[PDB]
């Protein structure tokens, strides 16, 4: 952070800019997690303190729901775990606080223990976070109050809570600044607050990428950065068309991106590719299928939580065949359902069906995503681990090297992950 500084970026608020050149691959800075939380569905597979994935984790003797590398990771996490250790025993199977509430809880506990500036807040402090309180509508304030109620519902026996109005601000700050920690396959590991990483503004053609070493965020260049140039990360999945991207960005972050990808709309034509029929859909018919695809995407998202895998496959297959009458296979909405179908096949342990989908996805993914995308890398890595599991070694190693080649740039040549994948080779 010596060759970097915060500044006022016109029309963007505060931001981060380079004071020195950065080549592709260079580490700009690392940031320790101010607060972090392991997701519920990853309990028992990951250490809750350092996010180290290993076997043979020690259960928390009292709750039997927290797992640790050892006694040191148990004792070091205790200040954060004590917000949950007893409520998990008492509430039983009705302890259902959302991951946001869980994270927000740890934030307040951290402010009690370490009220002064942490190694996480060298350039931007948690108290200094943007909240967009002034922009919040009814539904957003309503979701915040539901989170505040659940915070006192499950945590009152443990944490010092400020007034309602400070918690509105904090929850708003969390939504604006928070990060999801993802693994190598871009699966949801947990949620964290990285104050210094939160200083960076968004772009759909970013010059940096955020990766994780346990609970430690690392920021590496994916484009050449010059002195005086602002550093942009990306807040969202960049597969989708400009309208889709900015609907998500206005919704969650209260801004419209004006990057070169959003200005030119360069990739939209290929992203929403229409087939070459003698009777091609009208602009209205295209509009209607696109409106349908985005509604199906949202429905499948909420359907994922409860519907059976075979039911989930069905809607993926139904969506595809309907859209395939006007959309090409490299169309992004086709790719979405293909990706979701691939994931269901993986849970079903249909390794052959999963590999089939992955093969249809990889080439269009390389086209739509920017260079050094971990979206592309993890798809290669999924393909690779599928070829290897099915004893197809030439195709497996080739795909895994494609993954490693990107991950060296994004993760750094000697990240624990790359040596994990090299062992597979």
């Amino acid at each position: 952070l010596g060759g970097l500084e915060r500044f006022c970026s016109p029309g963007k608020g505060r931001g981060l800019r380079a004071l020195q050149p950065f080549q592709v691959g260079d580490l700009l800075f690392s940031c320790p997690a101010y607060a972090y939380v392991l997701t519920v569905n990853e309990r028992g597979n990951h250490c809750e303190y350092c996010f180290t994935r290993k076997e043979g984790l020690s259960k928390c003797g009292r709750c039997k729901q927290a797992f640790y590398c050892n006694v040191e990771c148990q004792k070091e996490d205790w200040p954060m775990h004590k917000l949950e250790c007893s409520p998990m025993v008492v509430f039983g199977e009705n302890w259902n606080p959302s991951e946001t509430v869980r994270l927000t809880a740890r934030i307040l506990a951290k402010q009690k223990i370490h009220p002064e500036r942490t190694p996480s807040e060298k350039l931007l402090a948690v108290k200094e976070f943007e909240s967009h309180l002034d922009k919040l509508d009814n539904e957003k304030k309503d979701l915040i109050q539901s989170d505040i109620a659940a915070l006192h519902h499950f945590y009152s026996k443990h944490l010092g809570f400020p007034d309602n109005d400070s918690l509105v601000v904090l929850f708003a700050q969390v939504n604006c600044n928070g990060f999801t920690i993802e693994d190598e396959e871009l699966s949801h590991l947990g949620s964290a607050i990285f104050p210094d990483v939160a200083l960076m503004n968004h772009s759909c053609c970013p010059n940096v990428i955020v990766t994780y070493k346990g609970t430690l965020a690392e920021v590496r260049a994916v484009q050449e950065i010059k002195p005086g140039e602002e550093v942009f990360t990306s807040y969202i999945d960049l597969l989708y068309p400009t309208e889709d991207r900015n609907d998500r960005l206005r919704d969650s972050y209260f801004f419209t991106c004006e990057c070169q990808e959003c200005t030119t709309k360069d990739k939209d034509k290929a992203k929403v590719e229409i087939r070459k029929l003698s009777d091609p859909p009208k602009a209205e018919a295209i509009r209607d299928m696109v409106r349908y695809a985005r509604n199906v995407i949202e429905e499948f998202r909420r359907a994922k939580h409860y519907k059976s895998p075979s039911e989930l496959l069905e809607i993926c297959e139904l969506s595809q065949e309907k859209m395939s009458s006007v959309f090409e296979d490299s169309n992004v909405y086709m790719l979405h359902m293909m990706y979701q179908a691939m994931g269901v096949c993986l849970y079903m342990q249909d390794w052959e069906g999963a590999l089939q989908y992955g093969q249809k996805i990889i080439k269009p993914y390389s086209k739509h995503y920017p260079l050094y995308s971990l979206n592309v890398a993890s798809m290669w890595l999924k393909l690779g681990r599928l070829y290897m599991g099915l004893e197809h070694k030439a195709a497996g190693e080739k795909a895994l090297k494609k993954a490693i080649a990107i991950m060296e740039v994004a993760h750094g040549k000697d990240h624990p992950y790359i040596s994990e994948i090299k062992q597979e080779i």
Binding site: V174, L186, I236, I297
Partner: peptide, 8 residues
């Protein structure tokens, strides 16, 4: 939701 590369 929170900042991520995926989450379809």
């Amino acid at each position: 939701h929170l900042k991520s590369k995926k989450g379809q």
